[PDB]
C-alpha cells in the first residue's frame, strides 16, 4: 500500500522543490544573515 | 472497493469534446459530497458541515443554490473513467466533468474505441481523484486528450470512428456517370464546344470519363475558394462533383467537397499550407488517410492543436453525415447479375464431378475434396463479383461506401448480403459437401440456414473463451514483466540487436524487402547504436528514428544499401531491473522519447494481452 | 486540450517530473494562502458566475499558468529543504 | 422591466473593420438560436443584392477560352479576376454599368485603370487584370449589375456585343455566412438557445449593415400575409 | 432447477418455463464438459433451437426446445416430419426419434409441391447431418415446418431468413426482456404466432362457450352463456410480476354482446387485440444524425412522450419488521424521535403512510422505534439530553426510509400484527408491514429499447418535433436509426420491415409475414406501389405537385442511380419510393437531405432496467467487518470493485498517488479514510 | 401600385373549421418559400399557447393507479383520455378554469357531460370518458390552463385537492405543419416559388390565428437585433 516504484514515484523526481524568484531573494537574504557581528 | 467511486449506463455525447465527459450532476453531488459540504459554508447555503448534510439528506430539500455550489466545486477538477474490462493502460481516462440532468454518463465518441464499449447497454464506473497530487497526474499524464497514440502502435487512437468517416468520405468522393459518345476534349476546340452543348442535351454527363476534363469542368471554373462552395449553396455543383479551381497558386481540378474538407483542416490548426503539405485531397477520405492526417498533425503541428482537429473531423463528420442521408433499404443490397452464372457453371461442373465418380475414376474422397474446391473458386469469384458490380456500377452503394471508407463492413460480410455466404462446417470441422447458395437479401432456407448456424457456435464459444484468456495471458506477462521500469541515464552497455529488413524464405529462397509494417514496427522510434550513413542523409548515432526515418531505410534497401539495423534495445540492456531511455525508444502514449518512470513493463505485457483475445483458440498445446 | 501542454513538456527533462512540478507548486498556492503568485494584474486566471476564479477555484490550473510563463524554478535541489517552508510562512499572508 | 421581458436577448457586437463581425445574442427559447440563424444566413447570400461583373468583351477576342498576345494571363483566368472585382453604385438609376478600360504596352493593367464614371466606384483598385509585356494591346468592355445570389453564366447568357462572353454573378457584398448555437445556462432551466453568426463581408457594406438589411427583408416578406383571398 | 417466474411480460414466463438445462444434479453434467455438448449437434433438430441458448460461459447447456418438439414416452425430443411414398408427399405426420431419423433420406419444406407431387427432379434433402441433393423418388420422408426448426420466442421474428442467426439470438432474448407498455401494440408486420403466444401463455382472457355479455366492469366480465349460465370473470386489476411488471387485464368486449367461443373477452397485459404487443410500431427515418446515434445510440423524437407511448408502470415491495430485541421491543409508531411533523404527513395512519401519497427518496415509509446502544446509555448523550431536554426518548430511528434512486405513490400497504390469522411469522419477528408503491415510467434518455432483429441500443438525445427530419406533409418521424449499425451485423430483415412498414402506414393495414415463407421482395414493392398513390395521390387532388427541394434531390438521386434519368418526377418518384426511401427534408433548415432516405413502420420494444442499472453512486458508507473494505446493502450504495486489471491501468500511467489512494484512502486505510474525510471537510 | 410592388405576394386562403387551415402565397423570388415556410413551422409547433387538462380529483379515487366500481375503464386510462380533450376559452381573464361533471348509473359519459361554464367552450363533446355500468358512480373535478408547450405532471405538480392527480401537459393547439414549394410560372421568368402551408389545429385557437401569433414571434425576435454591443 506504499507508493508504486515506476511513474510519479520516481526516485529521479519524487523530490523537486519549486520556487518564486521572490522566494528565491529571500533565501539568499536568510545566508546574508549569517554573517556574524 | 474504492470510498469516492460510482457506476451508470454510458451514452453518446456528441458535442462533448476529449477533453470532457457528461457526469449526471444528482451523481457528481455523492460523489463530492465532502468538497460540496463545506463549499456550501464558505457560502450563505449552510452554516456548518452537519448542517450542510442535513440540508441534502433529502431530495426535495436541496435549493438550486447547491447545484450552483457543486458546478463551483468541481471547476477543474476530472474524474477517471472505466469500462468493464480495462485491457491496457487506456482502459481508465480522466475527463473534466460537465454536469448533467437524468441519469445517464455522456461519453465522447472518440474514446469508445480506447475502452471497447458500445451504447447497447455499456456502463462504465467513475472514480475521484482525491490529493492535490493524485488529481495533478490525473489531470496532467491520465487525462484523455494528451494521450492520443497508443502504446503498441505509434498509430492514433483518436480515429475518427465509424460514423466520422462516414461522414467525411461521403463530402469528399467524386462521381462518374454515362460513356455514349465521344470522351476526347483533350484535343479538338470541337471537342469543347459539341461536348459541351451535347452535355446540356442529354448525351454527355457533367462527370464522363473524358481523360483531361469531362463537360463539368468545361462548364463551371471557380476563381476564389469560397465561389465554389457559394455555387453548391445555390445548387449548381453538388459536393461530390468534378469542378475546377483556383487555389494559392495552381488551377486545380478537385471537388467541392474536397475542397472543403481542405479548409475543415485549414481552420482546425490555422496553418494553412501546413495543413495542406499533410493532407491527401486526391481520395476519399477513408479511416487510413484520415488515421494518417492525425499522426502527421501529432508530429508536425503539436499535441493540443492536434486535440482540435480531432474534435473538428468529428462535428463535420457528424453533421455531414446526417444530411448525406445514407440509409439502408433491402435492394441497396445488389446481388450481381453473375450470381447465377457463376452459381450455374459451378452447377454443372458438380455434374461432371458426379459423372466422374459414377464410374469408378475419383476415390470417395477426391470426389469430396473436388466438390469444396469447386465452392471455395466459385464463393470467392461471386465476391469480387459483387464489388466489381458496386466499384462500376454503384460507387455510392450504401452498404458499399461504409466499408471502403474506413467506417463500418467487412469484404466477408458483404458476400454474405449481396452475394453468398457458401460454406459451413459440420459440427466436429469437416466442412459440409453442400453450399448455402443463399444470400442474406433473400431468403436464407430453413436448412442453409441451420447449415451456417453450426460456426457460428464456434465462433461465439471462441469469444466466450478469450473474455477470460484475454486474462489468463496478461496475468502471466503481468508477473514477469511488472518490475520492468523506465529508470536510467543512457545504460552504457553498447550490445545492440540488427534489425532484418530481408526474409530468407517466402519461396525457398529470395531475398525480399520486409512489409512496410513489420519493418515499422522493427525500427519506429528506436536509438542507433551505431552510425549509418545511406542514401544521402547521414543518420546519426544514438538518433532516435521517427516513422519518417523508418521510411527512409526502407526507401534505401529497396535500392539495395542496407540489409540489417544497428539499434538498441530491450533484449540487451545492462540495467538490472529496469530498462534505459536510449534502449526502449519513443513511444511513450507520446510520440517523442520515453519518459524515466514510465510502467513500461505493463505497457508491454497489456498491449499483448489484448490482440490475444482475437487470435483462434481450439487447444493450448 | 489544455493550454500549451506541449510548452510546458518541453520545459522538462522528464514527463513525470512536470506533474510533480505543478502538484507541489499547487499545494503551496493553497496553503500558505492564494495570493502566492506571480502573475496576478493584468491578464490571469478567471471563471465566469462572475469574474471570481480571480480568488481560489483550480488550484494547478494556476500553478500550470504560471509555469508556463519563465518566472517559476523547479530544481532537484534548489532550496534547502526546511528554511523554504520558513520564509515562505514569513512573507506570504491569508493564512 | 424586470422579470420576462428584461430577461431579454442581449444583443452584443464584435466587429473589427468592415469584413468580419461576431453577433451574439442569448438567452432565447427552445430550438430558436436555429430558427433565426438559418433564415437570416439564406437572406444574407442571396437577398443582399449585390454588385457582379455579367459580361466581358475583349475587342480581338471571340470565344473565352483564347489567349491575347504580349498578355501573360489568358481569357479564363482574366474573366476569373474580374469576378473578383468589387465595385459600387449609389443610386436605382445604375441597374447596368458598362466600365471600360484600354492598356497599351509594358504596363500592369490594375482595377483602378478603368475609366472612372459618375455614380460607380471601385472598391477593389489594386486588384490584378493582367501583364502586358510589349505591343500588348487589350481593350474591354465588362459589364456590371445588380442582381441577388448566384446566377451562372449560362442562365443568363447576357448580349451587349455578338463576340462578347457572359460571367458567372456572385451577386453579394457578403463572403460567409456562419452560425453556432450554443448552450448556455441561466439560473433555473438549463435547455437554452445562444444564437451567434459570425459575418463575412468584402468590404462594400459591413457585417452589421448587411445583418440589419437581412432582417428587414425578413420583416418586409412577414407583412406579405396581410390581404387573405 | 426450480426459478422465480420470469414475468417481466408472459412471453417471458412461458419461455422461462419452457427452457432445457445442463447443469443441475450434477450426476448428468457439471461444470468441467464442455464445448461438445455446448455445440449444435446436428440431431437438434425441431427437437432444440440453435438460437435461444443464452450468451455468455453457460452457452448451449441451457436452451428452450423447439415448435412443433414434444417429449413422447420418455424424455426423447421427437421432432415431426411428413411421410412421402414415392413421389407422393402426405399430410401425415411421424414424430420420429433422433436415431431412426439418420435411416431415412429427409427433404427440407421449401420444395415446390403440387399436393402430393414433388415438383423438381433435382431437389434437396440430407440423409444423415449430411446435405445431399436427392432425387423426387428417394425422397422418403419431408420436414414439416418451418416453424417446428426453432422455439417459439424465435418464431415471433419477421423475416428471420434475412438475418444472421447470430443476431437472431439477441433478437430472441431481447422479447423475453419486454417490459408492458400501457399503450401495448402489435406489430405493423407479425410472423404469425403472435396470437397464439398470448393464447397458450395466459395473457388474455378467452370466452369458454357462446353467449351474451351482462356486465363489463372494470373489474369483473360477467357473460350470459346460451347455455343458460352466466359467470363472473374477475380481471387482475394491477398485479405485481415477479420482477415488477404491471399485469392488467383490459376488457374489450361491450355491454350485451354475443361473443364467439374462444374470443378475446380482456385483453393481457401486452396484447392490443389478442394478439401480442410490445413496444410500438413507430415511423421511422433510417439516417445519421449528429453523434446522437453513433456506435448505438438512438436519437427519440419528444412527440414520442406527448402522447404516453413508451411508458411502463413499476412497483417496488418495500418491506420493515418490528424486532424483538433483548434491549425492548421495536415499536412501529407514527413517533420519529428527533425532528420534524414535516416529514410525518404523509405518515398519516399512525405508522404506516398513507395511500396514494407521492414519496420521494428520504421520506419515511414506514416508522419503527428501538433501542439507543447495545447493554448501557451514554456519558456524553448524558449530558446533552440534560440541557435542553433531559425527558427524552432514548429510543433510535430505524425508519423505513424511500431508497436512493425513487418511489412513486403508494397503492396498497400490508400490517400483520400480534393475533395472527393463519400467517407464519418468523421467530422474533413482533410484526412485518409491506408498503407496495408504484410509480410511471415514461421513457428517457437512460432507457434502452431494441427491435425484434437485435438492433439494441440506448437513447441518447429526445429531439423537439420542431427540428426533427420530416417528411415532405409535414408528418416527422419518431426515431432516427444510424445506418452503421446494419452492414456489421447482419440482419436486413430489420431493413426490410421499415420497407413493409411504409407500405402499412398509408395504406393503413397490418400484415403477416412468416418465418420463411413470407412476404417477397416483388410482393413488397408492390405495395409500395399502392402505397405511392394514398401518399402521392392525395398531394396531387390536395391541389400541389413537387418540390424545388424534391426536384433537387431527384437530381442527386438520378447521379446517385436510384431513378431511371429522363422520367418525369412523378415517375421518378415512384420508383425512389418503391425502393423503399423518400425524400426528408431537414426540419432545423428545411433544407432537404441530399439523397433519398428510407422510412417506414418498425417495431421496437423498450427494455427492462435492473437494479443494477439504477446508477449507484457512494460517498463513504459501511466497511466489512472482517475485510476493512467498502460494503454497502440496504441504502448506502456500496463501493465499486478495483480490479487487477484496474491496476494496471493506473500502474502503465504515472499514477502513483491515484493508486496507493485506490489502495489505502479510499479503501483499506482504516485511520486513513478517516482523517481522509475531515480533511476534505 | 403597379410593377414590382403590384407583383406581390397573393396571400390566399382556404379554412375549414378551426383545425385545418391552408395557405397559399406567391410568387415569391428564389428559393423564398422555404426561407419562410420552415422557420414558421419551428415557430408553429415550439413557440405557440393552448389548452391542455392540468389536475383530477375522482372523489373517491386517492392514486392514480387506482381502478372506480362500476367503470369499465381505470383511473390511468380517463386521466388518459383526458389529456385529449381539447377546450376553449374566450379571454385572458380564463386563466384555470375547473370544469366539473357527475353521472351515475348505465350511462356513458362523453365530455358533453361536463356542466357549462360562461365563457369557456368544449370542442370535444363526443370524445369518451367512460362507460358506467351499475351503481356506478363517478364525480369529478379536472382542471384546465393556458400554457406552451409540453410540462410532464411531474414538473407542475397541482394541488387543488389532495387526493387529486396531476396531468401531462399539451399545451401546443397546433397538430402538424406541413409547407410545399412548387414552381410557378409568372410571364417572363420561370424559376419562381410558390409556398403553401398547411396547418393542423386542436380546435383551442385556428390555423390562421396560430400562423400570425407565429410570424410576429419572429417579427418580435428580428428586433432584438437593434442595440449593439
Ligand atoms: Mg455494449
Ligand atoms: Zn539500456
Redesign the pocket.
Given at each position: 500500500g506504499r507508493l508504486i516504484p515506476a511513474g510519479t514515484g520516481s526516485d529521479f523526481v519524487r523530490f523537486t522543490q519549486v520556487v518564486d524568484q521572490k522566494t528565491l531573494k529571500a533565501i539568499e537574504e536568510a545566508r546574508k544573515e549569517a554573517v556574524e557581528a | 472497493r474504492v470510498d469516492y467511486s460510482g457506476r451508470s449506463v454510458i451514452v453518446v455525447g456528441p458535442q462533448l469534446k476529449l477533453h470532457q465527459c457528461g457526469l449526471p450532476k444528482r451523481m457528481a453531488l455523492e460523489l463530492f459530497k465532502p468538497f460540496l459540504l463545506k463549499k456550501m459554508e464558505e457560502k450563505g447555503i449552510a452554516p456548518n458541515v452537519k448542517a450542510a448534510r442535513r440540508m441534502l439528506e433529502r431530495q426535495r430539500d436541496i435549493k438550486d443554490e447547491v447545484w450552483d455550489a457543486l458546478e463551483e466545486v468541481i471547476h477543474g477538477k476530472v474524474v477517471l473513467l472505466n469500462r468493464a474490462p480495462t485491457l491496457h493502460r487506456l482502459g481508465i481516462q480522466a475527463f473534466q466533468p460537465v454536469l448533467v440532468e437524468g441519469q445517464s454518463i455522456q461519453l465522447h465518441p472518440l474514446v469508445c474505441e480506447a475502452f471497447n464499449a458500445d451504447f447497447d447497454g455499456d456502463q462504465m464506473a467513475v472514480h475521484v481523484p482525491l490529493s492535490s497530487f493524485a488529481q495533478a497526474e490525473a489531470r496532467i499524464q491520465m487525462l484523455s486528450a494528451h494521450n492520443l497514440l497508443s502504446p503498441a502502435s505509434g498509430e492514433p487512437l483518436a480515429k475518427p470512428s465509424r460514423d466520422i468517416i462516414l461522414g467525411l468520405y461521403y463530402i469528399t468522393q467524386v462521381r462518374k456517370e454515362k460513356k455514349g459518345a465521344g470522351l476526347e476534349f483533350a484535343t479538338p476546340e470541337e471537342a469543347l464546344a459539341a461536348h459541351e452543348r451535347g452535355e446540356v442535351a442529354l448525351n454527355a454527363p457533367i462527370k464522363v470519363a473524358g481523360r483531361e476534363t469531362s463537360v463539368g469542368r468545361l462548364k463551371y471554373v471557380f476563381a476564389n475558394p469560397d465561389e465554389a462552395l457559394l455555387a453548391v449553396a445555390h445548387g449548381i455543383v453538388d459536393l461530390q462533383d468534378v469542378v475546377t479551381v483556383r487555389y494559392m497558386g495552381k488551377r486545380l481540378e478537385t471537388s467541392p467537397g474536397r475542397i472543403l474538407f481542405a479548409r475543415i483542416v485549414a481552420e482546425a490548426v490555422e496553418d494553412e499550407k501546413v495543413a495542406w503539405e499533410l493532407i491527401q485531397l486526391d481520395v476519399p477520405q477513408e479511416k487510413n488517410s484520415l488515421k494518417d492526417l492525425v499522426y502527421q498533425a501529432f508530429l508536425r503541428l503539436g499535441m493540443e492543436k492536434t486535440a482540435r482537429l480531432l474534435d473538428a473531423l468529428k462535428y463535420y463528420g457528424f453533421t455531414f453525415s446526417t444530411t448525406s442521408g445514407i440509409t439502408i433499404g433491402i435492394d441497396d443490397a445488389v446481388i450481381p447479375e453473375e450470381k447465377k452464372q457463376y452459381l450455374e457453371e459451378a452447377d454443372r461442373k458438380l455434374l461432371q464431378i458426379e459423372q466422374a465418380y459414377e464410374m469408378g475414376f475419383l476415390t470417395d474422397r477426391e470426389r469430396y475434396d473436388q466438390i469444396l474446391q469447386l465452392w471455395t473458386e466459385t464463393t470467392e469469384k461471386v465476391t469480387q463479383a459483387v464489388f466489381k458490380n458496386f466499384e462500376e456500377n454503384y460507387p455510392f452503394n450504401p452498404l458499399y461506401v461504409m466499408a471502403q471508407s474506413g467506417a463500418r463492413g467487412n469484404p466477408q460480410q458483404i458476400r454474405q448480403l449481396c452475394g453468398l455466404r457458401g460454406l459451413m462446417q459440420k459440427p466436429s470441422g469437416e466442412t459440409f459437401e453442400v453450399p448455402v447458395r443463399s444470400s442474406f437479401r433473400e431468403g436464407l432456407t430453413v436448412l442453409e440456414y441451420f447449415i451456417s448456424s453450426h460456426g457460428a457456435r464456434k465462433g461465439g464459444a471462441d469469444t466466450a473463451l478469450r473474455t477470460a484468456d484475454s486474462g489468463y495471458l496478461t496475468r502471466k506477462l503481468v508477473d514477469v514483466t511488472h518490475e520492468i521500469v523506465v529508470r536510467?541515464a543512457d545504460?552504457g552497455?553498447t550490445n545492440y540487436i540488427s534489425v532484418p529488413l530481408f526474409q530468407p524464405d517466402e519461396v525457398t529462397r529470395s531475398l525480399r524487402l520486409r512489409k512496410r509494417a513489420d519493418i515499422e514496427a522493427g525500427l519506429y522510434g528506436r536509438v542507433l547504436a551505431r552510425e549509418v550513413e545511406v542514401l544521402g542523409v547521414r543518420l546519426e548515432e544514438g538518433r532516435y528514428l521517427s516513422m519518417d526515418d523508418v521510411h527512409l531505410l526502407i526507401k534505401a534497401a529497396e535500392a539495395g544499401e542496407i540489409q540489417e539495423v544497428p539499434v538498441?534495445s530491450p533484449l540487451?540492456?545492462?540495467?538490472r531491473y529496469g530498462?534505459?531511455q536510449?534502449?526502449y525508444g519513443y513511444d511513450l502514449s507520446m510520440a517523442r522519447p520515453v519518459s524515466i518512470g514510465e510502467a513500461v513493463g505493463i505497457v508491454a505485457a497489456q498491449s499483448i494481452g489484448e490482440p490475444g483475445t482475437q487470435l483462434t483458440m481450439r487447444t493450448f498445446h | 486540450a489544455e493550454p500549451g501542454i506541449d510548452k510546458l513538456f518541453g520545459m522538462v527533462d522528464s514527463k513525470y517530473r512536470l506533474t510533480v512540478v505543478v502538484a507541489k507548486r499547487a499545494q503551496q498556492l493553497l496553503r500558505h494562502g492564494f495570493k502566492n503568485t506571480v502573475l496576478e494584474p493584468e491578464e490571469r486566471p478567471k471563471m465566469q458566475t462572475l469574474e471570481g476564479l480571480f480568488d481560489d477555484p483550480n488550484a494547478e490550473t494556476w500553478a500550470m499558468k504560471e509555469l508556463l510563463t519563465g518566472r517559476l524554478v523547479f530544481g532537484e535541489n534548489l532550496v534547502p529543504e526546511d528554511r523554504l517552508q520558513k520564509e515562505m510562512e514569513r512573507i506570504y499572508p491569508g493564512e | 422591466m424586470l422579470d420576462s421581458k428584461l430577461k431579454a436577448p442581449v444583443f452584443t457586437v464584435r466587429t473589427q473593420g468592415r469584413e468580419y463581425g461576431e453577433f451574439v445574442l442569448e438567452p432565447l427559447e427552445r430550438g430558436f438560436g436555429v430558427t433565426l440563424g438559418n433564415p437570416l444566413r439564406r437572406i444574407l447570400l442571396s437577398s443582399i443584392p449585390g454588385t457582379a461583373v455579367t459580361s466581358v468583351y475583349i475587342e480581338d477576342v471571340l470565344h473565352e477560352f483564347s489567349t491575347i498576345p504580349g498578355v501573360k494571363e489568358d481569357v479564363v483566368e482574366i474573366i476569373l479576376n474580374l469576378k473578383e472585382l468589387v465595385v459600387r453604385f449609389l443610386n436605382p438609376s445604375l441597374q447596368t454599368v458598362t466600365l471600360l478600360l484600354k492598356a497599351e504596352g509594358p504596363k500592369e493593367v490594375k482595377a483602378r485603370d478603368f475609366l472612372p464614371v459618375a455614380d460607380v466606384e471601385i472598391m477593389n483598385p489594386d486588384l490584378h487584370i493582367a501583364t502586358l509585356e510589349e505591343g500588348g494591346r487589350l481593350n474591354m468592355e465588362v459589364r456590371v449589375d445588380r442582381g441577388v445570389g448566384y446566377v451562372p453564366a449560362e442562365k443568363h447568357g447576357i448580349k451587349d456585343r455578338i463576340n462578347a462572353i457572359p460571367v458567372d454573378a456572385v451577386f453579394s457584398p457578403v463572403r460567409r455566412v456562419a452560425f453556432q448555437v450554443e448552450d448556455t445556462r441561466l439560473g433555473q432551466r438549463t435547455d437554452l438557445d445562444k444564437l451567434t453568426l459570425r459575418i463575412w463581408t468584402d468590404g462594400s457594406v459591413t457585417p452589421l449593415e448587411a445583418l440589419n438589411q437581412a432582417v428587414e427583408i425578413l420583416r418586409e416578406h412577414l407583412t406579405y400575409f396581410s390581404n387573405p383571398q | 432447477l426450480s426459478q422465480f417466474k420470469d414475468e417481466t411480460n408472459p412471453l417471458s414466463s412461458l419461455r422461462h418455463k419452457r427452457r432445457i438445462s445442463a447443469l443441475g444434479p450434477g450426476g448428468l453434467t457439471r461444470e468441467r464438459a464442455g464445448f461438445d455438448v455446448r455445440d449444435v449437434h446436428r440431431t437438434h433438430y425441431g427437437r432444440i433451437c440453435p438460437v435461444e441458448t443464452p450468451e455468455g460461459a453457460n452457452i448451449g447447456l441451457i436452451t428452450s426446445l423447439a415448435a412443433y418438439a414434444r417429449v413422447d414416452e420418455l424424455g426423447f425430443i421427437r421432432t415431426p416430419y411428413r411421410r412421402v411414398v414415392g413421389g407422393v408427399v402426405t399430410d401425415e405426420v411421424v414424430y420420429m426419434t433422433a436415431t431412426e431419423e439418420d435411416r431415412y433420406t429427409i427433404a427440407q419444406a421449401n420444395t415446390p409441391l403440387e399436393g402430393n407431387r414433388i415438383a423438381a427432379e433435382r431437389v434437396v434433402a440430407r440423409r444423415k447431418g449430411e446435405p445431399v441433393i436427392v432425387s423426387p423418388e428417394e425422397v422418403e420422408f419431408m420436414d414439416v415446418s418451418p416453424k417446428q426448426v426453432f422455439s417459439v420466442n424465435t418464431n415471433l421474428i419477421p423475416f428471420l431468413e434475412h438475418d444472421d442467426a447470430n443476431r437472431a439470438l439477441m433478437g430472441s432474448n431481447m422479447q423475453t426482456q419486454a417490459v408492458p407498455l400501457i399503450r401495448a401494440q402489435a406489430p405493423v408486420v407479425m410472423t404469425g404466432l403472435e396470437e397464439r403466444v398470448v393464447r397458450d401463455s395466459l395473457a388474455a382472457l378467452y370466452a369458454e362457450e357462446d353467449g351474451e355479455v351482462a356486465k363489463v366492469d372494470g373489474n369483473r366480465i360477467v357473460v350470459r352463456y346460451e347455455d343458460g349460465r352466466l359467470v363472473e370473470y374477475p380481471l387482475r386489476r394491477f398485479y405485481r410480476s415477479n420482477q415488477g411488471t404491471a399485469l392488467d387485464q383490459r376488457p374489450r368486449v361491450v355491454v350485451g354482446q354475443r361473443v364467439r367461443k374462444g374470443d378475446l373477452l380482456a385483453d393481457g397485459p401486452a396484447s392490443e387485440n389478442g394478439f401480442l404487443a410490445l413496444g410500438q410500431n413507430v415511423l421511422v427515418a433510417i439516417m445519421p444524425f449528429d453523434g446522437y446515434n453513433f456506435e448505438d445510440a438512438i436519437v427519440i423524437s419528444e412527440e414520442l412522450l406527448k402522447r404516453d407511448f413508451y411508458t411502463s408502470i413499476h412497483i417496488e415491495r418495500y418491506e420493515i419488521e418490528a424486532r424483538d430485541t433483548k434491549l425492548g421491543p421495536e415499536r412501529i409508531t407514527r413517533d420519529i424521535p428527533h425532528l420534524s411533523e414535516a416529514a410525518l404527513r404523509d405518515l398519516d395512519e399512525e405508522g404506516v403512510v398513507r395511500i396514494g401519497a407521492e414519496v420521494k427518496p428520504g421520506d419515511i415509509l414506514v416508522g419503527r422505534t428501538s433501542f439507543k446502544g447495545e447493554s448501557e446509555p451514554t456519558p456524553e448523550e448524558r449530558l446533552l439530553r440534560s440541557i435542553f431536554g433531559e425527558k427524552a426518548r432514548d429510543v433510535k430511528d430505524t425508519s423505513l426510509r424511500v431508497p436512493p434512486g425513487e418511489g412513486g405513490i403508494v397503492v396498497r400497504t400490508v400490517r400483520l400484527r400480534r393475533g395472527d390469522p393463519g400467517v407464519e411469522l418468523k421467530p422474533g419477528v413482533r410484526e412485518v408491514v409491506r408498503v407496495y408503491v408504484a410509480q410511471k415510467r415514461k421513457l428517457q434518455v437512460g432507457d434502452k429499447l431494441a427491435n425484434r432483429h437485435g438492433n439494441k441500443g440506448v437513447v441518447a438525445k429526445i429531439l423537439p418535433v420542431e427540428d426533427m427530419p420530416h417528411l415532405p406533409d409535414g408528418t416527422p418521424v419518431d426515431v432516427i436509426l444510424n445506418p452503421l449499425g446494419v452492414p456489421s451485423r447482419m440482419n436486413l430483415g430489420q431493413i426490410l420491415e421499415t420497407h413493409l412498414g411504409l407500405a402499412g402506414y398509408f395504406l393503413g393495414q397490418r400484415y403477416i409475414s412468416p418465418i420463411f415463407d413470407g412476404a417477397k421482395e416483388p410482393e413488397i414493392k408492390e405495395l409500395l406501389a399502392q402505397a405511392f398513390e394514398v401518399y402521392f395521390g392525395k398531394r396531387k387532388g390536395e391541389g400541389f405537385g413537387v418540390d424545388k427541394r424534391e426536384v433537387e434531390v431527384l437530381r442527386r438521386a438520378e447521379k446517385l442511380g436510384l431513378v431511371t434519368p429522363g422520367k418525369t418526377p412523378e415517375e421518378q418518384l415512384k420508383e425512389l419510393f418503391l425502393q423503399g426511401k423518400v425524400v426528408l427534408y431537414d426540419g432545423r433548415t428545411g433544407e432537404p437531405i441530399e439523397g433519398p432516405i428510407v422510412v417506414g413502420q418498425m417495431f421496437i420494444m423498450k427494455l427492462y432496467h435492473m437494479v443494477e442499472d439504477k446508477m449507484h453512486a457512494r460517498s463513504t458508507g459501511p466497511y466489512s467487518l472482517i475485510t476493512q473494505q467498502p460494503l454497502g446493502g440496504k441504502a448506502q450504495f456500496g463501493g465499486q470493485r478495483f480490479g487487477e486489471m484496474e491496476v494496471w491501468a493506473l500502474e502503465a500511467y504515472g499514477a502513483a498517488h491515484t493508486l496507493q489512494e485506490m489502495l489505502t484512502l479510499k479503501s483499506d486505510d482504516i485511520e486513513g479514510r478517516n482523517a481522509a474525510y475531515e480533511a476534505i471537510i
Open positions: - | 536510467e545504460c552497455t538498441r540487451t540492456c545492462q540495467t530498462v534505459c536510449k534502449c | - | - | -
